Each structure stands twice: as structure tokens, then as C-alpha cells.
Design a protein around this ligand. Structure first.
Ligand SMILES: Nc1nc2c(ncn2[C@@H]2O[C@H](COP(=O)(O)OP(=O)(O)OP(=O)(O)O)[C@@H](O)[C@H]2O)c(=O)[nH]1
Ligand SMILES: Nc1nc2c(ncn2[C@@H]2O[C@H](COP(=O)(O)OP(=O)(O)OP(=O)(O)O)[C@@H](O)[C@H]2O)c(=O)[nH]1
Ligand SMILES: [Ca+2]
Ligand SMILES: [Ca+2]
Ligand SMILES: [Ca+2]
Ligand SMILES: [Ca+2]
Ligand SMILES: [Mg+2]
Ligand SMILES: [Mg+2]
Lengths: 897, 941
DNA sequence: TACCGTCGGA
RNA sequence: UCCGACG
DNA sequence: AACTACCGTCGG
RNA sequence: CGACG
């Protein structure tokens, strides 16, 4: 309680633009009758007054916190303050641009403030102040306004942000600015009318027509207003087709067959392409529209050019009138785009094996694939090392630097070589060095492969080229039969056969996470020309008793993606399983069903009652949301117990699958599940208080007895590790080495050159001896500071600074080339590198290459040039970074040779 | 004409006794030098003897160096064979990885008209690689020799009199075919000839029609009477042809048609695999029309097993398995498509009668080897051409509409291609990406193992643009780079206004195939792509539920473009990058397309709705009977043999008769060109491709393309008579106005081509070039003068340095003046020395400019490539200082390389990254990263 | 004054 | 442009 | 002390 | 880290 002054105080020193106030307050970095005064508001860069970029600042000052659909964000991080004298330390983050949302577009980003705060229901770090208290924290966040940068902030939403480092579990809480110093009673940022959270929520959800909803679920729908989305277009009432019924089963079971998905007209789809700047028209988008959320797919039957969209009951999360423009605006979160290979995750393996007709054969196949994959990998690197052009291509494919190059506009350099080992190899190879000839490169290439082996031991990867995660859609047009799916691609899906569609074959579909044996299903891919224009989506039938998506771990067509696999080896043994009869767990899982109406009865009728009920929902929902979550604990418990049983289909496996199936829906479903319910369910149905071990596959080595038997144990320890160990032993054998050597007669060329001049001139000899000596001093400082585990980059740079200081008559002017702004590009730099190489190449080779790699590459390129054999090119750092190896050149050139 | 016969006795270079020991590659390349340097190979004054070193040479320069020691050879050496070729000729038995070493010569008429002078001058070409063929694989590339020779029936004014005024044609033909020709130790006998078109005479020795003639080496000094290239067995041309054609079983064929099938043995192909007899299904009947017309519906195409397709992918290194290949297999020629019904794993192929061009037993393994000429591969956008436009207008439901559209399309296509280059020009990273996507240099880079240079810059203008931007030059700040981009665009505009190749995004040229499986109804076609076919608005992986136009070039009849319905059949989904026509109906759709079929024909396929939707199909034309003018010589091989009798001697004589008779037939003047041009002019002046004269001439040229294969005789008199009796007289029509570069007509253009070129293309091109010229910069760049400044300051305080600096200055103007004479002089534009040779001579003079510690420090003599020393930097800088405005082309072409070096040196900034000095080879293996260009620009904006 | 279209430069 | 195939 | 916190998809 | 299921 005495939680009475957590936020920074606002002084009357109170007329500053909101952006100016927050950035000035950001002083916190820490000064509390000094003559502080309001300097003369029109700044366009923060430096003029951990830094907000100017573009953000201009939009904050002049753009009303909005630009290109991006909103400036008032985000803050709160962490427990160490001192425990009679709580949190606020750290207002820099102003940043984040994608906007319905609520910020309708009321203004400046009126929204988001914080990351430690959960009060959490852990040793939690201060004793643990001895209380949660009600007091929740009251602090909800019951009252919060003053900050001259605005009164009220809380209206909370969501789990997960474990965060000050590690503890932190909540994201959202606040709305209801009033302020610049605010007006009953629009620019400064001239803002005062609006209560209760009205802001009533605008979004139209509570008067939704009091029948469980308030917990209603509260969860607030997330639609905060969904970060691209505003595409606004549609007119006569352009919106609200259906009053979903597509239902033809078998009369009553099941909804298009849960979450509707059609849009082809023109609407075109506007999406135009607004988002997309190479083609998207077949389907994940979006929001009024109360509706889910997927929209092009009506392949739309021949006109008129804009329209439909909604369905399964999509509309609350009764909406769709009157306000912002409730009629199509909002896209993502579009169905070109697919990539998915591989096979380990959760799928137990179910795949559980459903195999021949478990021994299915195991044998997965293992033979992995052995074939690892053997290919090891063999390809060995072949690549033989030729620089081939090794450059392999080194480029193993690690991606484009992100690092784009952010820097160049390959970043530490001292005389690029930061990364893979860039050091390519850079040095581009200058003519050979890994099989220059030991320095040989060693580097040895590290990377040795580190690559260590990455394989840690993580088991079964990669299947013929798999992909794909948005799921339902078949509005009735062309697909119950067990048929349609899959066409927007481009070539490449597997070392290639595909543009799937036709006349079986496929597996699943959703991750898969738990029940039926959470994977085998189906027949049939390409229907009627659907040819829908690409990068998989289309399920709308016939049959139950929608196929429902079978995929309770899936639907509202944004769900399916794992789709058409690898014939993985598919052919699979035997479908009926959906499981889920046990009754109500003894352990209590559902709070209280409706908004029931909440209101406590207060009466009319605006005053409704507003009270609304702030009630918020506080109660905050309590629920802050209750410790057990999804992860129970998921891990299931993994450990199913491992022990080697079963995913027996009685405890179904129980745990049903349990975790309800723990994901916890916020929307109002499911209560505390520590005591977990202890009771374990005691009565599982292994009681016993703490379960971790599966053996969770460590790098087989620490068990006898040969591994669990499929994941078998693949990681009986297939993968022995193969990896065989390559490592081959690599360890190195000892064997007509070999790679540090010495390169090319790199001493400048040294020998200047030695001949020095022998005939005393004046030049003195400069040479000085140079030789100063280099010696720096090599001793490298031994001192580099060979000292303050940080390693800093220490290398420290020597590099001393190295670059080694500086030098027509001879001096020709050596120094003063007109060059970058002294590392003059002839003295070459000479220094050559002389250092000559004197320290065998004693201390890393010093020479780390200090002078850059110039050694220059010397090498110069020396290996041959008259009339083409021209070496001197690339600028920027232009060098934008180039990549040409895969076709390597294959074509290698074939010729 | 025995005066011609006199000048036809010492045409080939003599093979001296001192070179008999030489391997053929030696004899060839040694002979080439003697011929190029004007030294007599039997000159006794030189004391010539075989150098034993030549037998082990791995570089031709090593052999020629020995000759250049002699004073007689000390003129620039002739173009040299690449080293891998030469080694292959010396130790590889003339074959490497499916490539054959080729022996070729070019002949031109001797300008000397002495009665005793050689009629022709010979230039042996350097050994080279070309793809092999069945005949070179079966008998060895070293036994084949091909020449280009002037056609003795040429009527050009340039023909000497000894032939033009004389029995000369009969004497030349007899020279070619009567007996063996001695050359490099071997006896060569002609066995095939084909038209090689109009060729300019070599400068070393007015276009003339030349023939390509192929000789087989029947024997030679090292040959053995009845393998390595040197130990070869005697073999007669008559026998080699019998091996190819199995003449005993083909005497029923017209001998001229039989002769034309020799091309199948010479077709350049990749040998894939050899199938066993039991894997080969010879069909006795083609797929026939279901309506009983007898018409063949799969003319030239058959099925292969899925495993055969896989082997093709493997052997050729393809990304995926190709649905269809163009190939040869024994006597069969045509297309083979994967059997979509094949689920086994057994190798097999099938042949049809329409594919088999002679009766072949398929016993020999070389007659059982699938050979691939080409595969159906990823498609690209096509465009219109001058032949389609009049037919598209003829068939248009609204001529005025289509006319106005085609034009407005040309206009918008020009605007997008100018607007994309103008945006890209604003940032160097973006222009580089645009230049890289503009052209393809991968092929050249892979062959030379680097970017080839001419003097101080890459040869390509595209490579030069990127090479100089890679060193930091901006194309909006340096005029030399702007000028290069300008010239490049002009050239493309010139091509548009000359060829009117209007781009149509939704169009492609696609191999045609027939539907073996009966799923396509008549007038339905199936098109699936192997990957996304992009068009700015829409992208495609297949075509479904739309109308398409299909056509073949040459298109002449109104019905040579056909509008049909694209229907995607899931049964055929695995056949990609081909267009499949129906095998139902009375006539195969392929036949309607200028008489086409499925043996390698490609169709122009258009699915652009604005172009498709106005088109109205025409019915097939009522063709005239032209037998009065086109006379087919149908003489069979059997009939030829009756002149001689039966048995092996008779057959051998008949075979050589076929050859000589077919040479005479092949050397007769061809009228395809004249009659096609006549049709163009007539249809132009009438502005009609559908009236009676248009149909007659379309039917005529339709017959003359088939000429050599059909035995059609059509002489000058018959052309005249044909024009007289059917076409209103033997006239000489005006050239269309669009043949000229500016509008020479009166008033507004009337013909659609005139309209598009002169009303649309020309004004728009001048408009774009006006706005492109306004969206763009100086020659000067202070950075490039940094070294020049640096050294004036030194040489302002040193007399010795100043003397050096002045000699450099003076000698640069010396070479500059030489550049203005050899390259700049418009007079030198035509000279025996071509542009590259003239540049190099100036470059050599430039590189000859050459510099005590200051000299050592400038020279860096330990560097093997003096062009990388600091001197080369000072030289380029000074030259730039002096001539950046007066002679920009000179500075950049001589010193561009070092200028690039100085620029990258000067623009480097401390701690702002490191410039990278790439090796020439490593530089050529890199390509722009499109994903980097887009990611970086987005961060910038 | 004697053709056009598709590919490729081993 | 030149050279080499092909339709 | 010692129990004990999930999978997948895209982007950055 | 940032969204999303
Ligand atoms: N305009 C023009 N068209 C040509 C030329 N050469 C071939 N063609 C085209 O090719 C056609 C003949 O095609 P081919 O497949 O080579 O021969 P074919 O008529 O099918 O006869 P076969 O070889 O027995 O199958 C005709 C023309 O349409 C040419 O030089 N000029
Ligand atoms: N393992 C795991 N699955 C999640 C998590 N969050 C969402 N899911 C998956 O998403 C499912 C919830 O689907 P949603 O699309 O978000 O909502 P819904 O269940 O369809 O309910 P509505 O919003 O009313 O349509 C459940 C899970 O299968 C998570 O944190 N962990
Ligand atoms: Ca869902
Ligand atoms: Ca749902
Ligand atoms: Ca043909
Ligand atoms: Ca044919
Ligand atoms: Mg659901
Ligand atoms: Mg034909």
C-alpha cells in the first residue's frame, strides 16, 4: 500500500508537448531549487533538447502520434526495486513506432500506455513485502487512475507477457488516458475530450447488446481492438453480407463446417494487394472486421468488380451493429503467402508411431532418412573445402549475414577482420586465400564445422522437404468430398521432385500442438480446377459429420495453420484414429460462467450501473488473468509421464491431453485451475506427489541403461549421435596433417621489398627498424590483453588502436599517401602488415591476422594478379556487402574444371 | 570450263614432310601460323624440322614461340585455341564431356584474278569446342571437317569472272564431290551440304551466299587399312552413310529426301542413355483422327518412361525432371513426353511412324541411344512480331479498336521500362541490381573464369557499369556512367522501332505436345507451368477457364493464329512447361498453325485478354494448285541404282551419285527470301493478308520452306511465270515505308506496322528520351585527380621528380593522339583491324608508359602484374586530369581499372567498414543480392 | 537486296 | 552485332 | 536448497 | 525481441 508514488512526478515547469515531457523525463537516466525552465516545443530532433529516432519524434510532435498506419507507443517496464524500506522502479522506454490497431486509430495512440509489470502471484526474487497483498496490487492497477506525463491513466486490459529478465513472470497491462492537464470536458493530441474507459469499452463491444456473455469471455474480446493490423479499406453497409447462419453439416449433426472463415469479393482482395504493396492478389487473409475475426477467402465465383465482404456467426465474437466507420473497416493481420518446408517436430513422432500400421518399419524409415541426411551434410562440407568457389558457396549457405549487413550497410569489422568467422573466411577467400593452403583459414573452417556438429548433438532435427505449415480454409463451393483436400501453391515448392499443387496422393494434416492420437489425420489431396485460383491455402471439405479442422486438436478456419505433409514414406503407414472420448475433469476444472448481466444485477440499471459493472469486469478479469498458469507445467508433466509409459494413447495420456486441451482456452473459457487442483488430479489419476524425471533425450548423451527404446531416444542416441561421433572422429584424425601452412611467401613481399631499399639506405633502415620495433611492442600487448577473460571486443580494439598508431622525405609521402582519408588504405599499412607477418607468422599468427587481416588480403590480391588475366576489383565496403555467391556460376564453373 | 578447273588445283595448304610426325592438333595449329604469317610451309630457306617438344605441348603459344624464334615469323600471332581445347585435341581424342573438337575453315574468293592463282583463299579456324553429334560420337570428331564456301550459283556483282562468265558451277561442284581433298595429313571426302546464308567476306582476304559443306576423313597417313585419333582405320563416306541410313532398307525413298536426313546424324545433341531392344516399343501406327479422316494426331511425339526422364535430369544436371525433351533416337526425330500413366520403374521409350525418318533396325547401340537436343524448361514472357500483327488485324472483330490498343500497349510498356530505370538510377545499389537483371553475363564469366576486359574496362557495357559502381562511382554524378546507360537504352529503343517486338506479359513460346490420354476435347488446350509465371498484375502457375491464342512462326495465312480454350486437366498436371493439344477432332490443331506438328515445334501462346478477346477464327485456306511452277524431283534411291546394277559396288556408286546430285540440287538458287519479301511488299501495298494474291503467296512460301526435303525445283523462270499468271505480272514492288527509319510516307500512316512504328513508337521514344534526359552529373571528379595532385606537390619541390612527371604527361598525350587516330577516327571504323584489335594496340602503347627510391616505390617490381603498382595509379590519375573533358572515352577505356581503384581508396572512411580487393576470378562468381537491395532501401526510407 | 521465330556461345 | 544449333 | 513453468507460425 | 494460432 505505502505503492503511493511509483511513477515519475510531473513538475509545473506542465505545458510541454506530450512527446517532450516523456523524453525530458527519460533525466531518469538521475536528477530529481536548480533553475530548470521550459526552453522554447518546436524541436524536430531529440538531440537538440536509448534515443527516440527523429522520424518518431516528428510524428509525435507534428503527426499526432501516427504515420503510415504505425502508432507511437508509450511503453514502460517496471521491475521490483531492490531496497526494501517502506516497490517498483519505472523505466519509460524510448518512444517507438509499432503497428496500429482499431483502438489507437479510433481514439489516438497518445491515449494508450502499456507496461510490463512483475506478476503479483509469482519465486525467490519476489520481495518479502510474499509475506502479505495480490489484492492490493490488483487494486492499485485497477481501482484508480494513475498520473503520468500530465495524464490520468486507467487500466482496461492485461495479458501474460511470460518470463522476463529484470527471471520472473511479467504481465502486460494496458492503460487508457481518460483525462489530463490539456484535456477538455464534454482531434489533436493536446485538444482531447475526456472519455472514461467504460465508454471506450462500450464503444468497442456495444455492451448493451452483449450482457448475455460471460464477462470473462467478453473481457477477452477486448484483444480484437488491440490486434496490430493493417487498415485496408472501409466498407459501406450495403456492401456487408451478415449471414445469420453458418454452413452446417449436410449430415444434420448440426456441426459448423466453416467455423471462422468467410468469403470476400475479388475487388476487396485487390485493394489488399494495393494497400499492402504485394506482388500478387492474396487468396486469403487473416483479419478483423467489426466484431468478426478469422479468415476471408476470395469468392472464386465473383465475376463482378463490386466491393463486398460477408460475416458469419462463427466469426462474430459479439453482437455488433457495424455503424461506426472503424467497425466497418477491413483490418488485415497477415496474408496467405508463399510456403516453406516445415520439417517434423518431435511432438508429432509419438503420435506418428502410435498410428503406424508397422511401428518397426516406420521407425526404420525415419532413422534411414536421418542417417542419409547427416551423411549428405558431412560429405558436402568435405567436398566444398576442396575448391574456394565451392567453399564460399557452402559457407554462405550455412550462416546468413544479410540481416547484419543490411543493418550496418557493410560487413562489420573487429580490428582487421570481419566480426564473424564465416565472413572472415569469405572475405579472405575473395582475396585469393585457400582454406586447404592457408592454415589460418584451415583452422577457422575447422571450428565452424566442429561447432556445427555440436549444434546437431544438442537439437534433433528430422527435416522433411515435402511438408509445410498452411492456413486452413473451408470449401464454400461443395466440390470436395469428406476426406479430400485441395492444395495449390503460388510458386514452385522445391524438394530435391518439385510441386506447384498436390494431386492424387495421400497427405497428413495436423495442428501443433498434437496430443491425441486423432490429432493427425491422413487424407486424399485432390486438385479441383474450380479452386485453382486459391493458392498457399489448404481447403478442407464442408461435407461429412464433423469438420476436419475440428479433428486437428480442436482447430478451425480462423487463422489456424495445419502441418501438411505429403512425404510418401511418412504418410503410407498412417492409420487414422477416431476422436477420443474425453474423460470428465470437472472435479478439477471449475468454469466461471458469470455473465455481464449477472455482474450488473449487483448494481442495478442505467448508465451508472453499467459503468460500474464494466470496471467490475476489468478488476475481476485482472485477478483471473494474474492467477498462475499451469499449461507449461502440465504440458511438461504429460511429456514426462507419456515418456515413462511409452504411450500417448493409454488412460493417463488421454487425461493429460484433455487437461492441457482445456488449459490453453483458460482465459476465454473462464477455467479455474490452481495448485491444489493440480495436486488433487495428480494424486487421484496420475502419479501423485512424485516429481517426474526428464526424458533422456533432454540431454546431449545417452545416460540410460541398455539400448534406447523410445522413438525420440532411438533417433537422437542410436541413429544421430553415432553418425555425428563418426564424423567428429574423422575430423579429429587434422592430426594427420603437401599441407596447409601459415607461411605464405606472397605476404612477405612488401617486407622483402623494403629490406632491399633499407640495406642500401641508412635513412630508410632507421624507419624500418623503428617499424619492426613498434610492431614488437604491440605484439606483446596483444599477448597481454587478448591471450584476460574488460570485454573481448574492447580488448582487441585496444590493441588495434595501438597498432593503427604505428605511423611513419619523398619516401614518407609515398608511403603515407596523406590525401587518403583512410590511412588503413595507404602503402604504409601494407608494409606494416607484411613486416608483422614476416616476423610473427609462426610465433603468434592470430595477432598478425586479427590486427592486419585486411591488408594481408590486399597484398594477396595484388600478388596473385597476372598480366592479361583479368582485373582485380576494389569494392567499397557498402557495395561489397550487397553481393552474394552465384550458385549457378559455381556449378557451371566446377563442371568445366 | 577448264579455266576454272585450273584455279581449283592448289586451294588447300600443302602438308610438308617435316610435319608428318605431328599429332593432328599440331599440324592444324602450326599450319595456321604459316598461313597467317605468310610463310610457305615448304620453304627450304628456313631449315624447318619437327620440334619434339610440340608432341607434349599443352599450350599452343608454346609451339608458336618456337617458330617466332625464326626471323621469318617475327606480325601479331593469329587467334589462339583455348588451352583446354588444345589439351583435349592432344591427349583427349578430340572429345571432352560430350564436347567435340571441331575442324573448320572459311573460304572466300581470291581477289587475285591470275589464271594460275587459287580460286579461293582458305583460313583454317582455331580448334574449338562444339557439342558432339551422333556421327562424331560413332566415328570420332577428328574425322570431320566443315567449311564455309561461296555458293558458285551466286549472282552477286562481287563474283569473279572466271566463274560468272563461264561450266563453272559444274566444275566447282565436281571439285567438292568428285574426289578426296588432302589436308593436314588426311584425305577428306564431301558428304553433306546445307545453306549457310549470306556471309561477309573476311577482312584479312559485300555479302555473298555461302554454303556449309561437311567432309569425312576417309583415310590419311596414319590411317590403317582394314580407337585413338592417330591409329584410325580407313573408311569410305559411302560406308559411313550406309551405317547412318541403312540404305538397303531405304531404296524406296526419294534420294533428295534421304540426303536431307543426314542432318540427323549431325544434329548437336547430348547422349543420355542406351536402351535395350526389349525397352523399345516401335508402334506401327500413329494416333489417328477419331473421325476417320486418316489424319495423324501425334505427328512427331511419343512417350518415354518416368525413369528415362529421370536419367535425362541426372545426365544433364537439371533442377527437376523435365516433362518433355526434343531429341533423336535411331531413325526417330521429335518430342518425347513423360507417360503420366507410368507407375513402374522400368526404362522404356516408344517411337511412332511419324517420328521415324527411315527404316532403321535399331541394332547398333548408337542407333539405340536417346540423344537430347533441348528440354522443355522454364518459360519467359514473349512479345509480338511483324508477322503476327497483320494477321491479328485481319482477324480482329474491330480493326480500329485492336489497332488503338496494340499502340497504347506499346506506349505503356515503354513508360514502365523507362520509369523503372529512372527510379533505379537514383541509388547505386538499385541501378546495379537493374543492370544485373537487364542482361546475362554468367555464360561469359563461366567460360573465361573472370570478367573479360578490353584494355582498362570490362568488354560489356553492363559489366563496366557495375564494375565502376562497385568501386563507388555514382551514375547520377559521373557522366561517363550516365552516357553508358543512355546508349544502352537507345539501343533497346532502336530494336523496338525496327522489330516492333512489343512485350506481352501474358505470352510465351512453348513446345507443343499431343494428348495421348484423350482428356482434352477438340479446341481445348492444357498449360501448366513449372513455377510462378509473373505478370505485373496477376501471376500464374497454370491456365484455366480462359481463351488463348496459339500460333507458330512463320505466320502467313489468316488461320495461322487460332483462338482456343485453356482447360486444366488434373490428369496432366505433371506435364509442365509444354502446351498440350487435343488428339480429338478432324485435324490436329498443330497442323492449322502453319503446317506444324509435335516434333520440336514451339507455339506462340497468348492469354492476354485484350489481345485474345477481339480475335475471330478463320477457316483453313483454300490453297492453289502450284504444280505448274513447283516441280518435285521424286527420283528414288532405287531408280538411281538402276543406272549401275546390283551388289555392293553398285550401291557404293549410287551413294556417291546421291551426294553429287543432292549437292547440285542444294546449290540451286533459293527463292524463300525473295518470295517472302515479295509477299510482304504485295500484302503491304494492298494492305491485305486475306485476298486471293495473299493466299497464293502464303501457299507458295509454305512450299518453299520444305524445299530441300521435298525435292522442289523452282527456278527464276517459274517465279516470273507464277507472278505473270497468278499475281498480275512479274512486277517489282516498292519497299514498305516501315523499312526506313523515319516516316517517308504522305499524310498519316495507313498500314498498321507503319502506324505503330511512326505514329506510336517513334514519338513515344522521343518523349521518354526527353524525360530520361531530364531525370539525370559531370565528367570531373576531384577524387580521381588525387594522385596527380599528390605528385605535382612532390615534383614542385624536386627537379628529378618533375622530369619524371613531365615525361609521363608528354607520353600520355602521345598515346591519346594515337587513340584519336586508331579508334576515334570515323574513317578507321572499317579497316582490316577491328575495334578490339585497334583498342589493344593503343592499350599496349599505354601500358608501355613506364618509370631511385621513388621509382622503386612507384614500380613495386615484386608485383607480377605491373597494372597493380602505384605507378599505374599515378598514370591513370594524370591521364584523367588531362583528358577527362577533351577525350573521356580514352581515359576511361585505358585507365578505368585504376580509376576504380583510386575511387574506392579515396571514398573509404575510417572505421566505416573495409573495402575488399577481390581477385578477378572471385569477383566473377558473385552476384547482387536482391533481398539485400530491398531490405537496405526499406531501412533508408 | 535473297524470310521469320525459338535457343545458346562447350 | 558476329558464331553455332533448332522449328 | 532440493517442487517448478508448453508447442507451432511468421516477422524483426 | 515483436506480433499471431
Ligand atoms: N521461315 C522459315 N521457316 C522455317 C525454316 N526452316 C524451318 N522452318 C519451319 O519448320 C517447318 C518444317 O519443320 P520440320 O519439323 O523441321 O520438318 P517437317 O516439315 O515437320 O518434316 P519432317 O522433318 O519430315 O518431320 C517449316 C517452317 O515452318 C526457315 O528457314 N525459314
Ligand atoms: N500450445 C499452445 N497453443 C496455443 C497457445 N495459444 C493459442 N494456442 C492454440 O490456439 C487455440 C486457440 O485458438 P484461437 O484461434 O486463438 O481461438 P479459438 O479457440 O478458436 O476461440 P475463438 O477466439 O472464440 O474463435 C488453442 C491452441 O490450439 C499457446 O500459448 N500454447
Ligand atoms: Ca482458432
Ligand atoms: Ca475459433
Ligand atoms: Ca515440325
Ligand atoms: Ca515433322
Ligand atoms: Mg477452435
Ligand atoms: Mg510439319
Amino acid at each position: 500500500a505505502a505503492l503511493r508514488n511509483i511513477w515519475p512526478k510531473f513538475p509545473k515547469w506542465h505545458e510541454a508537448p506530450l512527446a517532450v515531457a516523456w523524453e525530458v523525463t527519460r533525466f531518469m537516466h538521475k536528477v530529481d531549487s536548480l533553475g530548470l525552465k521550459y526552453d522554447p516545443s518546436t524541436a524536430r530532433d531529440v538531440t537538440d533538447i536509448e534515443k527516440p529516432p527523429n522520424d518518431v519524434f516528428v510524428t509525435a510532435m507534428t503527426g499526432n502520434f501516427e504515420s503510415k498506419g504505425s502508432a507511437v507507443v508509450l511503453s514502460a517496464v517496471l521491475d521490483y526495486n531492490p531496497d526494501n524500506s517502506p516497490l517498483y522502479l519505472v523505466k519509460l522506454k524510448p518512444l517507438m513506432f509499432e503497428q496500429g490497431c482499431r483502438l489507437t486509430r479510433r481514439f489516438g495512440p497518445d491515449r494508450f500506455f502499456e507496461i510490463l509489470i512483475p506478476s503479483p502471484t509469482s519465486s525467490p526474487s519476489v520481495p518479502p513485502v510474499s509475506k502479505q497483498a495480490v489484492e492490493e496490487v490488483i487494486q492499485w492497477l485497477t481501482m484508480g487512475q494513475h498520473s503520468l506525463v500530465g495524464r490520468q491513466w486507467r487500466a482496461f486490459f492485461a495479458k501474460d507477457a511470460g518470463y522476463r529478465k529484470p527471471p520472473i513472470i511479467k504481465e502486460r497491462v494496458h492503460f487508457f488516458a481518460e483525462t489530463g492537464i490539456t484535456f477538455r470536458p464534454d482531434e489533436p493530441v493536446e485538444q482531447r475530450t475526456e472519455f472514461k474507459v467504460s465508454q471506450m469499452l462500450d464503444w468497442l463491444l456495444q455492451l448493451d447488446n452483449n450482457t448475455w456473455q460471460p464477462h470473462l469471455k467478453l473481457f477477452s474480446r477486448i484483444q480484437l481492438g488491440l490486434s496490430k493490423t493493417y487498415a485496408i479499406m472501409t466498407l459501406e453497409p450495403h456492401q456487408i453480407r451478415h449471414h445469420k447462419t453458418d454452413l452446417l453439416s449436410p449430415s444434420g449433426t448440426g456441426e459448423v463446417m466453416n467455423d471462422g472463415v468467410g468469403r470476400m469479393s475479388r475487388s476487396v482482395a485487390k485493394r489488399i494487394r494495393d494497400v499492402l504493396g504485394l506482388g500478387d492478389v492474396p487468396s486469403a487473409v487473416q483479419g478483423r472486421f467489426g466484431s468478426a475475426k478469422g479468415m476471408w477467402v476470395i469468392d472464386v465465383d465473383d465475376t463482378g468488380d463490386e466491393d463486398w465482404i460477408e460475416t458469419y456467426p462463427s466469426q462474430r465474437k459479439w453482437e455488433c451493429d457495424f455503424v461506426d466507420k472503424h467497425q466497418r473497416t477491413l483490418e488485415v493481420r497477415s496474408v496467405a503467402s508463399e510456403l516453406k518446408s516445415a520439417g517434423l517436430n518431435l511432438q508429432l513422432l509419438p503420435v506418428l508411431e502410435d498410428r503406424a500400421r508397422d511401428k518397426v518399419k516406420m521407425r526404420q524409415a525415419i532413422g534411414d532418412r536421418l542417417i542419409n541426411d547427416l551423411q549428405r551434410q558431412f560429405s558436402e562440407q568435405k567436398h566444398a573445402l576442396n575448391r574456394p568457389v565451392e567453399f564460399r558457396q557452402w559457407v554462405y549457405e550455412s550462416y546468413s549475414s544479410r540481416a547484419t549487413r543490411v543493418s550496418h550497410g557493410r560487413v562489420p569489422f573487429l580490428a582487421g577482420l570481419p566480426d564473424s568467422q564465416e565472413e572472415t573466411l569469405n572475405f579472405l577467400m575473395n582475396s585469393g586465400f585457400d582454406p586447404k593452403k592457408q592454415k589460418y583459414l584451415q583452422d577457422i573452417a575447422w571450428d565452424l564445422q566442429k561447432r556445427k556438429c555440436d549444434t546437431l548433438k544438442s537439437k534433433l532435427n528430422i527435416r522433411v522437404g515435402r511438408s509445410a505449415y498452411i492456413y486452413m480454409i473451408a470449401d464454400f463451393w461443395g466440390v470436395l468430398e469428406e476426406n479430400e483436400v485441395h492444395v495449390g501453391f503460388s510458386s514452385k515448392f522445391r524438394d530435391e521432385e518439385s510441386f506447384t499443387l498436390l494431386s492424387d496422393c495421400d497427405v497428413l494434416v495436423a495442428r501443433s500442438p498434437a496430443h491425441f492420437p486423432s490429432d493427425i489425420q491422413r487424407v486424399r489431396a485432390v486438385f479441383k480446377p474450380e479452386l485453382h485460383s486459391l493458392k498457399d491455402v489448404i481447403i478442407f471439405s464442408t461435407k461429412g459429420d464433423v469438420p476436419l479442422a475440428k479433428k486437428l486438436s480442436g482447430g478451425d478456419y480462423d487463422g489456424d495453420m495445419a502441418w501438411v505433409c505429403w512425404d510418401p514414406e511418412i504418410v503410407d503407414g498412417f492409420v487414422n484414429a477416431e476422436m477420443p472420448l474425453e474423460p470428465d475433469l470437472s472435479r478439477y476444472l471449475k468454469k466461471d460462467k458469470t455473465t455481464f448481466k449477472q455482474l450488473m444485477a449487483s448494481h442495478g440499471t442505467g448508465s451508472a450501473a453499467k459503468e460500474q459493472t464494466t470496471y467490475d469486469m476489468i478488476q475481476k478479469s485482472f485477478h483471473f488473468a494474474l492467477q498462475p498458469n499451469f499449461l507449461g507445467m502440465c504440458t511438461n508433466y504429460k511429456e514426462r509421464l507419456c515418456y515413462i509409459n511409452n504411450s500417448v494413447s493409454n488412460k493417463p495420456a488421454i487425461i493429460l491431453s484433455s487437461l492441457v486441451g482445456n488449459l490453453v482456452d483458460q482465459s476465454k473459457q473462464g477455467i479455474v485451475f490452481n495448485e491444489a487442483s493440480w495436486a488433487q488430479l495428480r494424486r487421484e489419476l496420475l502419479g501423485g506427489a512424485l516429481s517426474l524425471p526428464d526424458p533422456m533425450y533432454k540431454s546431449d548423451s545417452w545416460l540410460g541403461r541398455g539400448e534406447p527404446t523410445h522413438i525420440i531416444d532411438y533417433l537422437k542416441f542410436s541413429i544421430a549421435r553415432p553418425a555425428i561421433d563418426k564424423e567428429l572422429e574423422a575430423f579429429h584424425n587434422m592430426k594427420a596433417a603437401d599441407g596447409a601452412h601459415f607461411w605464405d611467401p606472397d605476404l612477405a613481399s612488401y617486407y622483402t621489398f623494403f629490406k632491399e631499399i633499407s640495406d642500401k639506405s641508412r635513412s630508410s633502415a632507421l624507419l624500418f627498424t623503428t617499424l619492426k620495433n613498434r610492431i614488437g611492442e604491440v605484439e606483446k600487448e596483444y599477448g597481454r590483453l587478448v591471450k584476460k577473460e574488460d570485454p573481448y571486443p574492447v580488448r582487441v580494439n585496444q590493441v588495434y588502436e595501438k597498432w593503427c598508431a604505428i605511423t611513419p622525405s619523398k619516401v614518407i609521402r609515398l608511403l603515407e599517401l596523406s590525401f587518403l582519408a583512410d590511412r588503413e588504405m595507404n602503402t604504409w599499412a601494407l608494409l606494416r602488415a607484411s613486416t608483422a607477418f614476416k616476423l610473427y607468422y609462426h610465433k603468434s599468427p592470430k595477432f598478425v591476422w586479427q590486427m592486419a587481416g585486411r591488408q594481408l588480403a590486399y597484398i594477396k590480391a595484388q600478388m596473385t594478379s597476372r598480366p592479361g588475366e583479368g582485373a582485380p576489383a576494389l569494392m567499397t565496403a557498402f557495395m561489397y556487402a550487397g553481393l552474394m555467391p552465384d550458385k549457378k556460376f559455381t556449378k557451371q564453373y566446377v563442371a568445366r574444371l
